[PDB]
Motif scaffolding. Structure first.
Motif, PDB file in Angstrom:
ATOM      1  N   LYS A 120      -3.940  13.753  19.112  1.00 50.66           N
ATOM      2  CA  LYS A 120      -2.747  12.988  18.764  1.00 50.66           C
ATOM      3  C   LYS A 120      -2.747  11.634  19.465  1.00 50.66           C
ATOM      4  O   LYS A 120      -2.958  11.549  20.676  1.00 50.66           O
ATOM      5  CB  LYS A 120      -1.487  13.770  19.142  1.00 50.66           C
ATOM      6  CG  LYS A 120      -1.211  14.954  18.232  1.00 50.66           C
ATOM      7  CD  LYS A 120      -0.169  15.885  18.828  1.00 50.66           C
ATOM      8  CE  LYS A 120       0.893  16.262  17.807  1.00 50.66           C
ATOM      9  NZ  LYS A 120       2.160  16.695  18.458  1.00 50.66           N
ATOM     10  N   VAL A 121      -2.509  10.576  18.697  1.00 53.09           N
ATOM     11  CA  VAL A 121      -2.478   9.224  19.245  1.00 53.09           C
ATOM     12  C   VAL A 121      -1.111   8.903  19.840  1.00 53.09           C
ATOM     13  O   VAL A 121      -0.078   9.131  19.208  1.00 53.09           O
ATOM     14  CB  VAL A 121      -2.817   8.175  18.171  1.00 53.09           C
ATOM     15  CG1 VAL A 121      -1.783   8.200  17.055  1.00 53.09           C
ATOM     16  CG2 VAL A 121      -2.911   6.789  18.791  1.00 53.09           C
ATOM     17  N   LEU A 122      -1.112   8.373  21.058  1.00 54.62           N
ATOM     18  CA  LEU A 122       0.129   8.020  21.739  1.00 54.62           C
ATOM     19  C   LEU A 122       0.686   6.703  21.208  1.00 54.62           C
ATOM     20  O   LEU A 122      -0.093   5.821  20.850  1.00 54.62           O
ATOM     21  CB  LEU A 122      -0.106   7.917  23.248  1.00 54.62           C
ATOM     22  CG  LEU A 122      -0.180   9.241  24.007  1.00 54.62           C
ATOM     23  CD1 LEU A 122      -1.098   9.113  25.214  1.00 54.62           C
ATOM     24  CD2 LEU A 122       1.209   9.688  24.437  1.00 54.62           C
ATOM     25  N   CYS A 123       2.006   6.599  21.170  1.00 55.79           N
ATOM     26  CA  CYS A 123       2.648   5.390  20.684  1.00 55.79           C
ATOM     27  C   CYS A 123       2.116   4.206  21.495  1.00 55.79           C
ATOM     28  O   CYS A 123       2.474   3.997  22.654  1.00 55.79           O
ATOM     29  CB  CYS A 123       4.173   5.491  20.755  1.00 55.79           C
ATOM     30  SG  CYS A 123       4.935   4.120  19.812  1.00 55.79           S
ATOM     31  N   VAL A 181       4.737  10.116  15.927  1.00 57.58           N
ATOM     32  CA  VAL A 181       4.834  11.252  15.017  1.00 57.58           C
ATOM     33  C   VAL A 181       5.044  10.790  13.580  1.00 57.58           C
ATOM     34  O   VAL A 181       4.894  11.566  12.637  1.00 57.58           O
ATOM     35  CB  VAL A 181       5.986  12.193  15.416  1.00 57.58           C
ATOM     36  CG1 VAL A 181       5.823  12.659  16.855  1.00 57.58           C
ATOM     37  CG2 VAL A 181       7.329  11.504  15.219  1.00 57.58           C
ATOM     38  N   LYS A 182       5.393   9.518  13.419  1.00 53.64           N
ATOM     39  CA  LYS A 182       5.624   8.948  12.096  1.00 53.64           C
ATOM     40  C   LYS A 182       4.834   7.655  11.917  1.00 53.64           C
ATOM     41  O   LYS A 182       4.269   7.122  12.871  1.00 53.64           O
ATOM     42  CB  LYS A 182       7.116   8.681  11.886  1.00 53.64           C
ATOM     43  CG  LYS A 182       7.782   9.668  10.943  1.00 53.64           C
ATOM     44  CD  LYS A 182       9.248   9.330  10.729  1.00 53.64           C
ATOM     45  CE  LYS A 182      10.149  10.495  11.110  1.00 53.64           C
ATOM     46  NZ  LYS A 182       9.975  11.655  10.191  1.00 53.64           N
ATOM     47  N   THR A 183       4.802   7.153  10.686  1.00 49.58           N
ATOM     48  CA  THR A 183       4.083   5.923  10.381  1.00 49.58           C
ATOM     49  C   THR A 183       4.662   5.239   9.147  1.00 49.58           C
ATOM     50  O   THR A 183       4.836   5.895   8.121  1.00 49.58           O
ATOM     51  CB  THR A 183       2.585   6.190  10.149  1.00 49.58           C
ATOM     52  OG1 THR A 183       2.049   6.954  11.235  1.00 49.58           O
ATOM     53  CG2 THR A 183       1.815   4.884  10.013  1.00 49.58           C
ATOM     54  N   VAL A 216      -5.047  11.117  11.822  1.00 53.40           N
ATOM     55  CA  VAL A 216      -4.967  10.816  13.247  1.00 53.40           C
ATOM     56  C   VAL A 216      -4.417   9.414  13.483  1.00 53.40           C
ATOM     57  O   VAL A 216      -3.475   9.225  14.253  1.00 53.40           O
ATOM     58  CB  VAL A 216      -6.344  10.937  13.924  1.00 53.40           C
ATOM     59  CG1 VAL A 216      -6.245  10.590  15.402  1.00 53.40           C
ATOM     60  CG2 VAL A 216      -6.911  12.335  13.733  1.00 53.40           C
ATOM     61  N   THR A 217      -5.012   8.431  12.814  1.00 53.96           N
ATOM     62  CA  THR A 217      -4.582   7.045  12.950  1.00 53.96           C
ATOM     63  C   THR A 217      -3.080   6.910  12.731  1.00 53.96           C
ATOM     64  O   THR A 217      -2.436   6.030  13.302  1.00 53.96           O
ATOM     65  CB  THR A 217      -5.319   6.128  11.956  1.00 53.96           C
ATOM     66  OG1 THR A 217      -6.734   6.235  12.146  1.00 53.96           O
ATOM     67  CG2 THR A 217      -4.887   4.680  12.133  1.00 53.96           C
ATOM     68  N   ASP A 218      -2.527   7.789  11.902  1.00 53.78           N
ATOM     69  CA  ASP A 218      -1.098   7.768  11.609  1.00 53.78           C
ATOM     70  C   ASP A 218      -0.376   8.889  12.349  1.00 53.78           C
ATOM     71  O   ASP A 218       0.832   8.821  12.573  1.00 53.78           O
ATOM     72  CB  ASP A 218      -0.863   7.900  10.103  1.00 53.78           C
ATOM     73  CG  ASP A 218      -1.492   6.766   9.318  1.00 53.78           C
ATOM     74  OD1 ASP A 218      -1.840   5.738   9.935  1.00 53.78           O
ATOM     75  OD2 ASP A 218      -1.637   6.907   8.084  1.00 53.78           O
TER      76      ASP A 218
END
Ligand SMILES: [Zn+2]
Ligand SMILES: [Zn+2]
Ligand SMILES: [Zn+2]
Ligand SMILES: [Zn+2]
Length: 101
Positions: A3-6, A18-20, A75-77
């Protein structure tokens, strides 16, 4: 955990996206998402990847893909998507994870 951090978070520690927003072309967390997208409705003229509308029963559907539900993850999103999204190209170069025989 993939998971990518903000990246646009300044909490320290920071939060996770968690959103995009597609119209923004960037992935953020709910917090930032709140500031970036001020109250206006029905959706601040901004689209997203499988949002959370008033409709709630079990799972979630894509933006405009009722025939094909979401069965993938980007992942990117850091959000859920459908294989039809990855096929068209919307998430072709995107690093996703699907089942394996
Ligand atoms: Zn954030
Ligand atoms: Zn936006
Ligand atoms: Zn994606
Ligand atoms: Zn889709």
């Amino acid at each position: 955990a993939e998971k990518v951090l903000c990246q646009f978070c300044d909490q320290d520690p920071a939060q996770d996206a968690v959103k995009t927003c597609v119209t923004c072309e960037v992935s953020y967390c709910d917090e930032c998402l709140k500031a970036t997208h001020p109250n206006k409705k029905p959706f601040t003229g901004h689209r997203l990847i499988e949002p959370i509308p008033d409709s709630h029963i079990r799972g979630l559907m894509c933006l405009e893909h009722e025939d094909e539900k979401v069965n993938m993850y980007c992942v990117t999103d850091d959000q859920l998507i459908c294989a039809l999204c990855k096929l068209v190209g919307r998430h072709r170069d995107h690093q996703v994870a699907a089942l394996s025989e």
